[PDB]
Symmetry: D2
């Protein structure tokens, strides 16, 4: 039986409320031991060791917790057969991707959460955790990058996103689909991400105490340029536009970001549209403005890759190539 | 044959550089189904859509309701969902208003605009289309203005009512309607923009890991009437954004929680005590749609309980 | 507190080997929302669901309408969509009938049955749930019986109204309803099974490349009342199946074209001249749902024009 | 500029009606020359050569047309840089998979169709054909098995299915998602199928003049066993069950197929449910009955693979391993 290390960060998976049938709960409240012991069947499939890294709602996830997770996995790689990270849903898609690009360990890292607290009727957490361990324990799960496991499905860290505010089925890889489905503790993998990840990336956070500052501005009809200006005035290293349609920008926001791109701020166009690439060669001449197109990376995922890109380079043509490879 | 007025605003259906009369002329079969008259309102990319154009459309439809049997509005894709809901809430006319656009310009191969426009006229001309609110007609599908949204950056099939589904499907120039929106719309709303030349200022701040509070604070510093939060999961906020908006809500700004998540309601009774913070939960309204309703709510009340009631009825 | 009757039929929610009283006792919070009484009708895998059980359910609900405030039916997943539509068309009771099942048994980890049952009771107890036809409640979603279908072999979120969307979503024990089925149902249909001990024989044949005609011919040889074709694309037929069913339609068998394709209507005015062949086009009804309506149509008429009318109204 | 060979079989892509704005049409009517000449932009990207193989509605697709396509592609492999097959929508998913398992040629084979006839307003055919040639022309398209290209998307032959009766967007890979999206005549591939295809399969139809007889029976409430019996009585080689839920069968149908499996007929359980695997280890003890579970293969696809399996073997355990590998 493999050795599996659960790194706990909080989330609703570790959350509780007063009633099995009322929606009110709080988060990252129960400890890693409690979760494990709630799933005795884990003994059938793994020797599980739990460690509490933080205990927070993933709505409060942040760069320092990402640094700690990356360093820890890379540090402790030799001591275990794989990692499960228990985490809230809200920003799982971000942390997954950060880890997808910064872990160098060749053992599976599988992230997991729940939409219902442990106390709720038909809570999803227990089986989700079980399945995350199955996955981390499967030899065939290696060399697929960092994963998320929810609702019987194995998802790659890059494409995976939450699609619904409440559904147990929220996590989908919305552009290229899942890697594998889980049934009866076994996985039939039929896909692997082609974009470079983990040890094929140049990103190394081992000696980083902070990450480049990147903020996200939303576009909409009659959008204020004040948010963008505020990030410019603060000397942000980069800005991601949550564009409309195929990464389009309101004229005010466009004008502000075009000025900033000239001064040296990195500007990535992404889109608020939930599926599909923000493309080159549509309505915005990126080359002319010095902007980068995000491809299928949603704004928050684009921020993740931009911060990491910014650790290697400030040159927009090089940042674009990074956005084309990872 | 019914009389249908086409109000043109631009968009890639018009690529917005072609005039309304050119668009009509390009689809001669429109005369088989309506007597079409075209008026140019503006001619822009909808990524530059704004409050002034919104007010102009609403007033025009309301003023000209009696001179026609139905309206089609040619518009860009990118913010179609925003204009549609705004008109859903402010048009007082009982006659069909159908918005339409295109993902490809009419010079591209297999250009979608011509048949899209045809179907939008079919819809606007169909008796059965009245009393269903403002509609968007794309890819053979009639969609209500409240729920409709663009789901893909490039797909001709992008427009979807992602929470509650379409109203009807169009085949061979006819619609089988099986659904109508229950939320109150058009003449059942109190919003009346007939005399307004501007709208309350409402901005949208995004949430993500490690989010800066600076965008929220910049809207507060400018005295924005309202701030919508594109929250994470079920409308949650990064702590520094939460702190900023908690202050704002008790200091003369209305604050709506919505979600960056593409489907599902931002609910009450989850992790945020909205009553405690003076916040309004947006339900199924996404950030940009929530902004629309907030702006219009603020024409009526600054009372956050009354704003929430509005968000529970429209 | 309303009185709710649970009619049990089996399914994996009962894994069907557990009794109704066991299922009720397993969710004590049901008493917070209703006075629940359980009756066992049968206890089977819904893959063995049949005409006799359908008739029993319909008669029971119709007979007992006045003794209760609402019904929940515990049922298997696999043919839930079929039983739901049958009851959608034959129940005459004005009170909510809500069907429910589970993908995982009670003993399995994160078993879905208990909360599913809770929610189905919430639904059946809600005033607002009346007059919406027969409902299926799964994964926090209220779905009409006409459009609902299972979309995945194992996913707890499998149940979806794939053409027209859900009616409402359930959060914290309350439903925000935004939709109601337009097709006529329950007391607005003519179908009355009160006196029937059997139904017209209706079978289904599949289409694919190189399809044999032998299945179709075997139902014709048995004198079946009707055949539904699970067509390819927009309800098309493989030539040898087409030839067989063309004969059957003029030789005393009713023939409905539906589609193996999971969404979208089988339409008239595409590649098959239904009037020429004496065929009926199923619309959005999938093959198993088309069978339901055909059987019930054949209790009223064998005239294929009247059958098509029925298919255009229910 | 690459040499690309279009093999035309008919379909609505080659169909026409009297009105641009009415739904009535007939199929497989226009010739390959007309289609090509309707898309002059193809000269920008390829030297296209057309040949008419058949001109039929894909609703009448059949084994002999499959054999002719496979042999032809295998025969003519050395003479061209890749193949586009113009084909109806209705059974494209079947022909695609057959070809996915029997083509041995290492050049791209890309299938394509249209939901609207050429005569219709906003007809989808032209750009569809263009994009099919782009794909067949792209070096990076090789070694991915047989493809389908519709609505700007590149799809693998195995998972691809039609999901709606009329929508231009119908074609989706519903379990594992697409391989690549096309924009501005370029593809960003991020996936490739893991199941064995083309030259990695043992199936060789070069000398076959017919295929093993395999029929499909549907399950539903009160299902008749007469269809299944009729295929048994005719000595069919195999039978595919379009099962309910996770490949379950009505008792009558179950009893008939269980008897047949004992006599030597190959029985594959599939499902009428549009997504997800028909699994082992659920309600049916396949080993006990001698049945084969189809995995994510829909009934029509399962038939394609069962016919080909039957060319190598009649042994259920071997057929199961084929269903686990291809
Ligand atoms: N269901 C969840 O886990 C949501 C929670 N707010 C989180 O992200 O921590
Ligand atoms: N396809 C389109 O219409 C996009 C364009 N930018 C618009 O929204 O005006
Ligand atoms: N999950 C289930 O209920 C499946 C079971 N075979 C049934 O339909 O009865
Ligand atoms: N759209 C199409 O091509 C449908 C046609 N019946 C076919 O499959 O040939």
């Amino acid at each position: 039986l493999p050795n599996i290390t659960i790194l706990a960060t909080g989330g609703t998976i570790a959350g509780g409320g007063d009633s099995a049938t009322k929606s009110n709960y709080t988060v990252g409240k129960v400890g890693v031991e409690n979760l494990v012991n709630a799933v005795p069947q884990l003994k059938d499939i793994a020797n599980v060791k739990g460690e509490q890294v933080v205990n927070i709602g993933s709505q409060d996830m942040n760069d320092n917790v990402w640094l700690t997770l990356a360093k820890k996995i890379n540090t402790d790689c030799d001591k275990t057969d794989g990692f499960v990270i228990t985490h809230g849903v809200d920003t799982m898609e971000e942390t997954a991707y950060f880890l997808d690009l910064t872990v160098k360990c060749d053992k599976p890292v599988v992230m997991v959460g729940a939409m219902r607290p442990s106390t709720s009727m038909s809570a999803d957490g227990p089986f989700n955790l079980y399945n995350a361990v199955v996955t981390a324990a499967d030899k065939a799960s290696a060399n697929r990058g960092v994963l998320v496991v929810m609702n019987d499905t194995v998802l790659d860290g890059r494409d995976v996103t939450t699609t619904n505010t409440t559904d147990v089925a929220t996590f989908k890889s919305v552009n290229y689909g899942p890697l594998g489905y889980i049934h009866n503790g076994k996985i039939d993998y039929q896909r692997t991400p082609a974009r470079k990840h983990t040890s094929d990336t140049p990103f190394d956070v081992s000696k980083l105490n902070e990450l480049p500052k990147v903020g996200i501005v939303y576009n909409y009809a009659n959008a204020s340029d004040l948010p963008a200006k505020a990030l410019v005035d603060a000397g942000y290293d980069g800005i991601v536009s949550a564009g409309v349609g195929n990464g389009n920008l309101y004229k005010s926001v466009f004008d502000t970001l075009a000025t900033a791109a000239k001064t040296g701020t990195a500007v990535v166009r992404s889109s608020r549209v939930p599926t599909g690439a923000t493309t080159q060669d549509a309505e915005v001449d990126d080359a002319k403005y010095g902007f980068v197109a995000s491809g299928t990376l949603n704004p928050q995922k684009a921020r993740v890759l931009l911060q990491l890109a910014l650790t290697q380079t400030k040159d927009p043509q090089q940042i674009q190539q990074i956005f084309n490879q990872y």
